[PDB]
Curated annotation (Swiss-Prot), chains A, B:
Source species, domain of life: Bacteria
Protein name, entry field: Fimbrial protein
Record has Acyltransferase as a keyword: no
Any one GO cellular component localisation term in the record: membrane
Family: Belongs to the N-Me-Phe pilin family.
Subcellular location per the Swiss-Prot or TrEMBL entry: Fimbrium; Membrane
An example Gene Ontology molecular-function term: glycosphingolipid binding
Membrane protein topology class: Single-pass membrane protein
Main location: other
GO biological process: biological process involved in interaction with host; cell adhesion; type IV pilus-dependent motility
Keywords for this protein: Disulfide bond, Fimbrium, Membrane, Methylation, Transmembrane, Transmembrane helix
Length: 126, 126
């Protein structure tokens, strides 16, 4: 498994991680999840949040007891490892009602490119 | 051996290489070696010249009839491959008093991470 591909999805996480404080602070202060398809109270426009491999980072989600707000980074459509083109990786706030905030990682890309922490689970059934 | 680590050093080479015509212009113009500890005529301060894996690119070196000007790249101390952390790669002017200017490449990183034109040599002895 390519460390070049691993590293690109690594940009995404870091650019998304970059908004935890900003998103959890609005959730627990105003009760809602902020969305940035337009710039919004201290948070930049999703298409303005980017780097070498990330095209945009969008906030949103649906407010719930423990959290729910989502931070979705979208990969560029080019100059990126072919399987990752246009894919997304998603951080979700949780435990908002229990203590320290948690942020579960998920992605719609192949687990072979993700960190262990961002991978799905697959098992057999009866 | 990691192509990904190889790729990190290659960025230093590239960024250091992008200052060769300027440094060369100064030597040919003033018989001197410019020092960019701070921005100076035409060239940005060393830390303003960086990249994903590269922290700074400094010019300096000691002037002679053959040239002697150096352009050194310093890798970041983190977010880079651990054997390359804070390692340097140097471009050095020569041949100024014999013919076409040349730039020799040296580095203090391990040879297993370097292009062939930048590796040192080790021989045996009696």
């Amino acid at each position: 498994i390519s460390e070049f591909a691993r590293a690109q999805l690594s940009e995404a996480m870091t650019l998304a991680s970059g908004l935890k404080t900003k998103v959890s602070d609005i959730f627990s202060q105003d009760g809602s999840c902020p969305a940035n398809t337009a710039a919004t109270a201290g948070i930049e426009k999703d298409t303005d949040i980017n780097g070498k491999y990330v095209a945009k980072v969008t906030t949103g989600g649906t407010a719930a007891a423990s959290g729910g707000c989502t931070i979705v980074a979208t990969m560029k459509a080019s100059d990126v490892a072919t399987p990752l083109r246009g894919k997304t990786l998603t951080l979700t706030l949780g435990n908002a009602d229990k203590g320290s905030y948690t942020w579960a990682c998920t992605s719609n890309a192949d687990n072979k490119y993700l960190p262990k922490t961002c991978q799905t689970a697959t098992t057999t059934t009866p």
